[PDB]
Amino acid sequence: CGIVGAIAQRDVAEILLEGLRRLEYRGYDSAGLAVVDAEGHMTRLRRLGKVQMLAQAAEEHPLHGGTGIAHTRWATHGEPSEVNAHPHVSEHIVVVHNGIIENHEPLREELKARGYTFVSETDTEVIAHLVNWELKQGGTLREAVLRAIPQLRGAYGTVIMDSRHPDTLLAARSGSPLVIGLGMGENFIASDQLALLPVTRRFIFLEEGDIAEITRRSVNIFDKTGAEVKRQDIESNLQYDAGDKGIYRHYMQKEIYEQPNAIKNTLTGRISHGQVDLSELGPNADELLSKVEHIQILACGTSYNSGMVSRYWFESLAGIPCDVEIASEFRYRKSAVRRNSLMITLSQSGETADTLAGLRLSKELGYLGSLAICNVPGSSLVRESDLALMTNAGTEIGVASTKAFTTQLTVLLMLVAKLSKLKGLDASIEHDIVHGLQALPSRIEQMLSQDKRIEALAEDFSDKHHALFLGRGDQYPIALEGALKLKEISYIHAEAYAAGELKHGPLALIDADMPVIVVAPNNELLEKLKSNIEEVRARGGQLYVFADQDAGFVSSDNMHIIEMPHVEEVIAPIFYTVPLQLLAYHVALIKGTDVDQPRNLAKSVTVE
Amino acid sequence: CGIVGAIAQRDVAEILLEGLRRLEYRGYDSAGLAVVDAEGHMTRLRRLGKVQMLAQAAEEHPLHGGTGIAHTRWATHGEPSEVNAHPHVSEHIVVVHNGIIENHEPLREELKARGYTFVSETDTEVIAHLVNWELKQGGTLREAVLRAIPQLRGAYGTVIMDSRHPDTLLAARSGSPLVIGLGMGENFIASDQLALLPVTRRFIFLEEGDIAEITRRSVNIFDKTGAEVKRQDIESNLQYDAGDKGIYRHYMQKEIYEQPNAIKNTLTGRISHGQVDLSELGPNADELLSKVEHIQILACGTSYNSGMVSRYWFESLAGIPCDVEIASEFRYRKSAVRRNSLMITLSQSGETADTLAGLRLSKELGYLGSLAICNVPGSSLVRESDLALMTNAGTEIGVASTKAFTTQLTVLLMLVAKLSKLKGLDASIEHDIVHGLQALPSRIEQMLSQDKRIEALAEDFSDKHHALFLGRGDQYPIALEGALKLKEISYIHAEAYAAGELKHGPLALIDADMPVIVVAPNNELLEKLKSNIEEVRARGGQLYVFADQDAGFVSSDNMHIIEMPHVEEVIAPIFYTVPLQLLAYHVALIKGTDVDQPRNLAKSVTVE
């Protein structure tokens, strides 16, 4: 989730609370900072709620100090939320981490043994009493820590502090990212370089394992053993616009509408000469890519749907057997490795628990090699992969992925043409794919200029609480997607069915008041589809159908047609996605929902 | 669908209306018979509705004749239901078919040319004016037909009659089954030997293509060309109990509760000596089965879910790469054939459009060979296959498959152990599978004796209209299944999610009033699951959890636990299915629904 850390000479709270705000997406149930003033007065503070719930519990009780550590959260397993909220104050040790401490039991028991007393349920409060115990046994903090770290198992990103000596903050990185922001006289710790974006812009990105010792006037980093290290330090880029929603009322909407430029980024330096280019893999790709006979794809939620759309392409175009499983199942299941199998995770975060263990698994199951289509660079998926292709999406703040989706398509789509050519197939296959790609941007541009109309439809969903999404083909999953959206950002019970599955059961749901969103280009499967539309139609189902301008569909009280600008077909599933995104967003407004942090959720799921 | 045909000396209506009643499952939108009395008075009759809607429109206007043909239907594409209802009276030619006439256009136009006039939209009414035109050009009916048949494309099962000469009925078979029931002085035609079950029990099962000429006192069958044929004639068996619901209020319920004996049938003559036996394939199976490296599985609705459960087994036990696609998508999609791929349809009917073309496709795509796990013998899937294994389910009348499911599992499960052994694997794998199999019956027995309790739960769903089904593992799809049920037989919007997918989106749906059915044995994935239960739990979601007696779960207003009799684990997905079946049925009663013919549906989808 979100974890921030100041240690300057000014007051560090209204920054700590900022860092949080700019990590509210990674987590939005509980929050709270801990600062201390000169003298030593600790001042822990927690609130259930948005970060603002804290903010306000700060104005009421301003916190002075130049040593604090904040923290937002995803309260998942539930639990007394304000009791189990960070930070936790082990007498004088305050901690806040990001992650999961595996051995959080073999410890909690062992300590406890030694008269310890965990007043709260939680793994953070274990870091504390652990580090603390280590003070007692000699050394300095930057020593008590360098000893306790290696006795923890998991992936975490804690930032330990001694209320008796706010002179130093400790920061370890074992999994969850922790970047350090460099200030003047001051420093800052963060889980992401986006918290600190306001104050510094100069970051030393902790490598994996580091236990950096930080003060106002120094930042000493040590490797895992305890050696000293000289981590470089770079200036940020991830600031294009930072987390400024701009003209846009919500992040999704801006993120939705960035798709057209967002793809351009992706198709940039890759569409070199009528034919997709991906040298970026370094001439050693055509030696593993080429032995490829099958493709396994790990993913979750939207990152999976994409995996789907692709399977259609990898086969009907690359001619390559391909599976596209949900990471959650894969990882725990004994399985049968195809011969010559390129594993291919499709995270946007790069840091998702499941798609990542998956990957990890893959390694042992003798796959041919990994490939990684992340959004975020140097991400756990990207560095443990073997090959990787980056979406160039830009940072996506929306809890509900959108441009990360469209980008993914574009990439995969590109990989297809590479693989296509790589396989002496028809040089025309690449050509065709490219033309789409190399014209997707302009086209989504086209599509968005329909905002108004879709915004109009959404009115019809005020009163509904169910919705059916139908598609067939390499649009089965596009219809999967637009459900997942609407479903998530408006709470409507939307469900997606592969069109030709209705009559085998689900078709019982239809009725007078059941809207049915359907996507329908000038596909070959057009008529097949045109049918199951008529099948639902003939049973009540109110029908919103996003159909190519030249489909043939005809308007009607029961059957609402939303003309679609003729698209290509290689990029058809991307295109037809967009309108479905608008609709989910707009219905969400009509619904009056947290368009940007839907309940029980929180962008990127990196827990486990 | 359902098509019946009398031609006796008594009055044939109260039989025709019976035949229909006993094919109401195959179709239940529109109906209607046509008889004629001695003199020649035709008497066509149609009604929207159950067959009974006709029945009653018969009592009001008794139909005398000893030559009639009836017919129930699935009105799918909708259309003026009483206008487009069979039979259709082309002046003197009355027809009724079962199936789809492809060229139903290149004809409708051509004829029409010749001053013809189709007062109704429909493909039946095309058979008529077609056969008719053929009278005019010479010959006798049994000649005008034998000429018109070969000018039709599709799969059909029409039974043509001449109102000017009820002396003869014609019957052709091009796809849809047509069996002939033999009486004394009288005959009968049928789409299934179950219509006629009351009158005769002696059937000559038309081969594929036959154009049988039938009168009271003869039944001449001719092959496709026009030759004479001597089709054998067998006595029925499919009459165990016929379509007599017995003690049981609905077919599902009886069919649900037949599972325990229904499996026994399946495990009969196959569990020969501590180890599954399937010689029934004839010593030429271990020569294709053995070269098998991958398994593709086609299916729809419940017949697919089974395909799922299996994939888990074929891999984690047989060690064999396996895909399990929805037939509807497969069939229309260019794809990549694994090397050495055993295709394997999983119909119960054997006659499903999609799973069958699928199969058909398979043939061209160089698979290694077909295998067929049908319920019904000599079924289109079973005869075009290459290998086949029959469920021994018994005829299932329920529109909502149940025992066909459990049987399928059992079979596949058996195939796994065959393949397992066939692959020098651990002799212990077979052993273990068998023990389950060879103890599934007794165990489901166990499970049903919980009826009451589940019947109790269902009370809690009166007011609900959504439901979430969660499972993980080789129970992801078992949770898929029990949704499809409830979803179909009660209209509740039930949805199944692989447990570990919640946090990536859908988990937004949960709330105060969202029941969540979850299946949870003493799996290894127990705790994983135990979690997402707690995740939903912690967000409102009312939780009905079907968990092993020794799970650990604890009762609670928000979390309803329904102890499950410890089962094995190889057969665990079958077992945990049953309770989910009860619940759908019981909720359906509380709902007050067509537990046996849910709306917009109709057992086996054989249209296209």
Ligand SMILES: O=C[C@H](O)[C@@H](O)[C@H](O)[C@H](O)COP(=O)(O)O
């Ligand atoms: O609608 C929500 C998004 O679809 C979300 O579900 C996301 O796609 C998954 O949780 C995947 O995580 P990553 O893409 O970042 O790995």
Ligand SMILES: O=C[C@H](O)[C@@H](O)[C@H](O)[C@H](O)COP(=O)(O)O
């Ligand atoms: O709940 C309804 C049944 O699940 C039904 O969906 C059936 O399974 C499919 O239509 C498959 O047809 P076959 O099994 O007979 O081929």
